[PDB]
Design a protein around this nucleic acid. Structure first.
Ligand SMILES: [K+]
Ligand SMILES: [K+]
Ligand SMILES: [K+]
Ligand SMILES: [K+]
Ligand SMILES: [K+]
Ligand SMILES: [K+]
Ligand SMILES: [K+]
Ligand SMILES: [K+]
Ligand SMILES: [K+]
Ligand SMILES: [K+]
Ligand SMILES: [Mg+2]
Ligand SMILES: [Mg+2]
Ligand SMILES: [Mg+2]
Ligand SMILES: [Mg+2]
Ligand SMILES: [Mg+2]
Ligand SMILES: [Mg+2]
Ligand SMILES: [Mg+2]
Ligand SMILES: [Mg+2]
Ligand SMILES: [Mg+2]
Ligand SMILES: [Mg+2]
Ligand SMILES: [Mg+2]
Ligand SMILES: [Mg+2]
Ligand SMILES: [Mg+2]
Ligand SMILES: [Mg+2]
Ligand SMILES: [Mg+2]
Ligand SMILES: [Mg+2]
Ligand SMILES: [Mg+2]
Ligand SMILES: [Mg+2]
Ligand SMILES: [Mg+2]
Ligand SMILES: [Mg+2]
Ligand SMILES: [Mg+2]
Ligand SMILES: [Mg+2]
Ligand SMILES: [Mg+2]
Ligand SMILES: [Mg+2]
Ligand SMILES: [Mg+2]
Ligand SMILES: [Mg+2]
Ligand SMILES: [Mg+2]
Ligand SMILES: [Mg+2]
Ligand SMILES: [Mg+2]
Ligand SMILES: [Mg+2]
Ligand SMILES: [Mg+2]
Ligand SMILES: [Mg+2]
Ligand SMILES: [Mg+2]
Ligand SMILES: [Mg+2]
Ligand SMILES: [Mg+2]
Ligand SMILES: [Mg+2]
Ligand SMILES: [Mg+2]
Ligand SMILES: [Mg+2]
Ligand SMILES: [Mg+2]
Ligand SMILES: [Mg+2]
Ligand SMILES: [Mg+2]
Ligand SMILES: [Mg+2]
Ligand SMILES: [Mg+2]
Ligand SMILES: [Mg+2]
Ligand SMILES: [Mg+2]
Ligand SMILES: [Mg+2]
Ligand SMILES: [Mg+2]
Ligand code: NA
Ligand code: NA
Ligand code: NA
Ligand code: NA
Ligand code: NA
Ligand code: NA
Lengths: 141, 156, 64, 114
RNA sequence: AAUGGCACAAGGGUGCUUGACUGGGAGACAAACAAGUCGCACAGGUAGGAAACUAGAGCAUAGUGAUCCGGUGGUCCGC
RNA sequence: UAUAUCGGUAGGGGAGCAUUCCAGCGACGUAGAAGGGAAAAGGGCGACUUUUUCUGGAGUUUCUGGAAAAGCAAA
RNA sequence: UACCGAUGGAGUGAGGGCAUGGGUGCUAAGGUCCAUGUCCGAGAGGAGAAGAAUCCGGACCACCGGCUAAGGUCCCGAAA
RNA sequence: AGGGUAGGGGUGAAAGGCUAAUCAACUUGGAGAUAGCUCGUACUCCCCGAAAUGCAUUUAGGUGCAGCCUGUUGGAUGU
RNA sequence: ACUGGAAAGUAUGGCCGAAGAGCAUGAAAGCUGCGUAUCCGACAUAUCCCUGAGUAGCGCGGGACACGAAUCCUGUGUGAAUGGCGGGGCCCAUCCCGUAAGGCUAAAUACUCCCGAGAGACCGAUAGUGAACCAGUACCGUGAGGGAAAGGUGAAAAGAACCUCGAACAGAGGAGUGCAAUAGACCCUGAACCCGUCUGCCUACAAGCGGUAGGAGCGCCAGGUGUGACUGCGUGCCUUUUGCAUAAUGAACCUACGAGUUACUGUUUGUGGCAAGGUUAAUUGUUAGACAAGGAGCCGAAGCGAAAGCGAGUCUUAAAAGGGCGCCAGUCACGAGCAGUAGACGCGAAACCAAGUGAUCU
RNA sequence: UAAGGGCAGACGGUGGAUGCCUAGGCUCUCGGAGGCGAAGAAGGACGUGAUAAGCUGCGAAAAGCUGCGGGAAUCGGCACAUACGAAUUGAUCCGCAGAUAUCCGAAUGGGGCAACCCGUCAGGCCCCUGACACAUGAAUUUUCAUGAGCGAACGCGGGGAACUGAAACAUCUCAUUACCCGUAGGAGAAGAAAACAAGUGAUUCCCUCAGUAGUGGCGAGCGAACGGGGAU
């Protein structure tokens, strides 16, 4: 193709819907709005959380809990991806190839099965036991 | 309606006059009234992914190569601007009938001045190649340095 | 303009792992000697928003 | 850009108004009146295409009745006899023979006169 | 209140008692939602009883009302 | 290829026509453009489209894609 | 032959007549309130003189072909 | 003849009279106030096709959620 | 050379090009004119020991801060310290940070009555400014104020000498000009409604939405076209309704005008690019919108718990899977649907408030 | 027999649709510039041409006067005009610099119903005319300098609604908006820690943080900052 025979992919562009333009289109007259009432008028809008005057669910239910400000949340990294990164080293904690100046916690879902010394901010007890069983070490710093 | 110059006074009293009820003179129903849902100033730019743009560029170049409109020529310079010399170059390359696009490695002011007045000729730098410009011309002419630049800068 | 979250909804609802809405049962604040122990424990437990009330709770939470 | 389809909008009306020639008074040329008249006529035409078949069958039956009474029978007796004998000539052909080929109608009647 | 149930009584007495329990809710009924109803298993420690067994209040169905803000008792987080 | 199906208001879905402008590719025009009158023909169907002639006396248009001040019978 | 899950878009939330079972009313109302069907609503065609829902019958388009329904066959008006 | 009293303000031998043919003022602006109300809503062909019920509501000619329609999908079950 | 009233058109054959932008010219011009690319050019006149007291702080009443009673401000009443003093969301202690009650300060930012040069998938005379022209004019009002309609002969006025009818150009018929006067001053084109004349057919015994389906005769020009004796069927349309020929609503008619649009943010979906990753924003560089940079940020990648926290587990428990929630391909765009915020499909109140104009009527 | 009528075609009338056309609008970009005025403004009144002036220009020197530079044959403005003149001893025109510049208007000698009436003191004419001066207020020591009024938006400051939303409404919202008033500049404001934070290092603006923390008849709603990336 050139500029003279351009063609979009099949089904990529669709024509817009145009209402209030006659009977044959199926969208004229009342123009998809029904007959009367509030919803038929220009400028009608739905009040969010309004149910006709019945007490809404967001007022019927109670508030609960609180959110801690200084919440230390770790990014989880598992043994399976540790072994995947190991199989193209034996000294992890690079982890940029991920995170971006974050705190990392090593978790035990797969298996290490290698001899690695892993440096991370946190480990689980199962993860520590797994890496030491496979013959590794932890640097919790 | 809010930008017309008439006043907001009720033209006729609400009841009793025997005609249609009327508000102010800026109504779209009245001759000289408001334009409803007319044009507003707009910005038509949108985003395409960089990799999508690169793919489109390479597709245009591949299409030119497959359809055999790419001619590689030697680099040339002009001591003084001269339209006749560029016309002769186009005639010798057999590109002077339809639209042609020459791709140059650098500015080459004398060459640009020479090609300025020719009607079916376009010039472009190698590093500024885009899909529209590549596709808009029947013939593509490259120099050796332009080929090197395009290969280095638009690969994969 | 960007959509604004409803403050009451953001104080009353929470998202679960598989995109469900977590909520607290509401009949247990101040008349509890009369009620039944099993009733009170079932109101203590954390419930989920009904499917018909979903997308309304989502509109309140800005479809999040 | 600004788009006003002046020529197409007028041409639609002119095409329809060529169809309302011959109407009475304002119904031929006044457009809202003329367009109103033309659509009601179209509903009539749909109905009358159906009614034309009944009208022509009734005319055939009346002509066959007269010719059969000339021959000595009635329509119902003649048609019963034809159906019993298995003659498949329809009422249009029978009416045409009765009006224009009385000898052929007579031979048909004589075939089932037994 | 009315209706349904009730002789092995669910009706009436005696003795001992506090199961008018703690951790609970396989599974159902009912239902716009909110609400509502019946009901486990097993563990801990008891009451009655020779034991088996029963006891998570009352023959059952009315006896109330959300959220927000406050009060009291117990036990994780902000400066 | 068969069978089945094809009345419809509110309403949902699908596929198209015309209009103004733009890009690319083609074209037409004082040996007569657009517009206006008359006539003829066409379309699974239709929105609409071609052709002939008179008036007219200078601009118009095909296809593919793009964008809308994108269609009136009642207020 | 299209019943459920999940999702996108709705409209409707003034109903009415007939038959059947009832309440109300006066065993009145083209009355009113429920229930079960049905039709009009949103349904053209045929008979009943002319009638929203009574009787027959669900219209893709064309036909100057044929058979039937309800109901009819002395004339207006098809057929004894 | 000249002058003074200015908007719910003036003036009223009091009628809610009069205040430039306007009175339980006029002009311009906020302003396209708001109107759960009435009216109106324009090209074409094809496929499908309702409801006028329940619950709640300062609710009853409005609206929310069910019920009933439609598009696209995955399951077997619907009559 | 051809057509033409007139070539810039078409067909040949040439030339210029740092100039093939444009406008004008009797039709559409790189080479007819003004210009354009490029280069040159100004007599002037302009522009470039001390350390801030009615303070810090405090009571009462208020205000501004995102905040509807910490920091900041103060009407009223009070009132220190000089290593000391202030803040870190109310108060205390430690710690940390700072040094009030004095002042000045460019840039990056906001705007367009005005001047110069440019542009538009903006309008094209009921549009676009109210205003293309006599426009804030005419007109209306005591006043404040409100507020129109109105463009086009022809290339060139060559804008019709003279004749005829007529009192007269009132108007016309000629002649003449001109490509054209049915371009003759209201002048390009010249539609509808509405109004006439001529020709063809029908019509004075006939009764309802005016059509529709049949069907002679007559009349025109070779199977077309006009009319329509006579026959069957037929209570307009819109809207609102359980239901409208309805004696419910609405329209004199025609032409023109007139009503789901756009922005942002979500969500679903069609189609795409990359893919365990996906994507840049503001902005910057080069040449002049394009190309390249820019990873801040956002989403995904692990959940459970109010939370500390633990983690394919976790919460509840003294403990038990006894129960709950979880384990057992995304992301960025383009097109479309829908939602919210904006006047948000259009027209329509009675009113409310602010600032002005009116006692020439009464 | 058509008094009249109906339908069709042709040809006219009216009217001004449509098509084509337009420098008249609309939205912007870039670069400048961002005032005018007591040396009298903006905006007006009356005049001014050979011939009445509707616009334009100009001001009793009145479609114009002078000089320098540019240029070289027509010019004497426009509303479909002629006459009569100017001009190669260089008109007209163009750039720059000058001259004149009535009356009103802040209006300023006093008044006043704008474009008018009436004056005083000195000076030059002869009841009456032409050139001066003669306002106020804050500075200055009578002299001197400034100010006043008008005007686009943007800035700062003083006052400050309501309709509306909350499906009623009073806290709240609309909104520290409309509007009134005062006052700068080419920009203004802010700005150099008695700061943020739990290491940074003055202001201002942009992208994020984030519809997050908070706030709220905890309703409708409102809504940061730290940090990070930039402009500077
Ligand atoms: K309609
Ligand atoms: K209530
Ligand atoms: K055109
Ligand atoms: K009913
Ligand atoms: K209630
Ligand atoms: K002409
Ligand atoms: K012309
Ligand atoms: K005409
Ligand atoms: K008829
Ligand atoms: K009436
Ligand atoms: Mg429909
Ligand atoms: Mg509705
Ligand atoms: Mg309606
Ligand atoms: Mg209704
Ligand atoms: Mg409205
Ligand atoms: Mg107003
Ligand atoms: Mg307009
Ligand atoms: Mg539109
Ligand atoms: Mg039949
Ligand atoms: Mg059918
Ligand atoms: Mg259908
Ligand atoms: Mg012709
Ligand atoms: Mg339109
Ligand atoms: Mg129209
Ligand atoms: Mg209702
Ligand atoms: Mg009802
Ligand atoms: Mg009834
Ligand atoms: Mg209805
Ligand atoms: Mg039906
Ligand atoms: Mg039969
Ligand atoms: Mg008969
Ligand atoms: Mg009274
Ligand atoms: Mg009066
Ligand atoms: Mg407002
Ligand atoms: Mg209004
Ligand atoms: Mg409303
Ligand atoms: Mg169907
Ligand atoms: Mg609903
Ligand atoms: Mg030229
Ligand atoms: Mg106009
Ligand atoms: Mg006369
Ligand atoms: Mg003509
Ligand atoms: Mg004409
Ligand atoms: Mg008779
Ligand atoms: Mg007769
Ligand atoms: Mg009624
Ligand atoms: Mg009827
Ligand atoms: Mg009405
Ligand atoms: Mg009427
Ligand atoms: Mg009517
Ligand atoms: Mg009408
Ligand atoms: Mg009309
Ligand atoms: Mg006649
Ligand atoms: Mg005519
Ligand atoms: Mg003088
Ligand atoms: Mg004075
Ligand atoms: Mg309210
Ligand atoms: Na559709
Ligand atoms: Na021409
Ligand atoms: Na004449
Ligand atoms: Na009328
Ligand atoms: Na006649
Ligand atoms: Na004076």
């Amino acid at each position: 193709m050139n500029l003279s025979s351009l063609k979009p992919a099949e089904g990529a562009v669709k024509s817009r819907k145009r209402i209030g333009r006659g009977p044959g289109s199926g969208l004229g007259g009342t123009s998809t709005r029904g007959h009367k009432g509030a919803k038929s008028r220009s400028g009608y809008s739905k009040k969010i959380g309004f149910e006709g005057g019945q007490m809404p669910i967001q007022r019927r239910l109670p508030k609960f809990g609180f959110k801690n400000i200084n919440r230390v949340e770790y990014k989880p990294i598992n043994l399976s991806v540790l072994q995947t990164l190991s199989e193209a080293s034996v000294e992890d904690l690079i982890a940029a190839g991920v995170s971006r100046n974050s705190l990392v916690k090593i978790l035990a879902n797969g298996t290490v099965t290698t001899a690695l010394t892993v440096e991370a901010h946190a480990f689980s007890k199962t993860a520590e036991e797994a890496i030491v069983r496979a013959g590794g070490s932890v640097v919790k710093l | 309606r809010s930008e017309l110059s008439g006043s907001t006074r009720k033209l006729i009293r609400q009841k009793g006059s025997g005609g249609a009820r009327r508000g102010d003179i800026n109504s779209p129903l009245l001759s000289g009234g408001a334009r409803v849902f007319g044009p507003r100033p707009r910005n038509y730019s949108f985003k395409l992914n960089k990799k999508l743009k690169a793919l489109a560029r390479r597709s245009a170049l591949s299409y030119k190569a497959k359809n055999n409109e790419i001619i590689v020529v030697e680099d040339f310079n002009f001591d003084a601007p001269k339209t006749k010399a560029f016309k002769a170059i186009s005639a010798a390359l057999k590109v002077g009938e339809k639209k042609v696009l020459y791709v140059l490695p650098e500015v080459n002011k004398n060459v640009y001045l020479s090609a300025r007045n020719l009607p079916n000729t376009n010039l472009i730098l190698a590093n500024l190649i885009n899909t529209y410009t590549v596709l808009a011309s029947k013939n593509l002419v490259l120099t050796e340095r332009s080929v090197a630049v395009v290969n280095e800068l638009f690969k994969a | 303009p960007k959509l604004k979250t409803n403050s009451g909804a953001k104080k009353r609802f929470a998202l679960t792992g598989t995109g469900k809405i977590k909520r607290k049962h509401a009949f247990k604040s101040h008349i509890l000697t009369k009620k039944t122990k099993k009733q009170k424990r079932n109101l203590t437990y954390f419930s989920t928003v009904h499917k018909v009330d979903e997308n309304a709770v989502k509109q309140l939470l800005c479809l999040r | 850009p600004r788009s006003v389809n002046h020529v197409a909008s007028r041409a639609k009306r002119k095409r329809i108004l060529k169809l309302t020639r011959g109407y009475f008074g304002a119904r031929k040329n006044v457009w809202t009146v003329a367009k109103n008249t033309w659509e009601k006529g179209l509903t009539y035409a749909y109905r009358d295409r159906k009614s034309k078949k009944r009208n022509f069958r009734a005319l055939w039956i009346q002509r066959i009745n007269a010719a059969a009474r000339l021959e000595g029978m009635s329509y119902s007796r003649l048609m019963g006899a034809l159906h019993a004998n298995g003659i498949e000539i329809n009422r249009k052909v029978l009416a045409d023979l009765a009006m224009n080929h009385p000898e052929a109608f007579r031979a048909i009647v004589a075939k089932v006169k037994n």
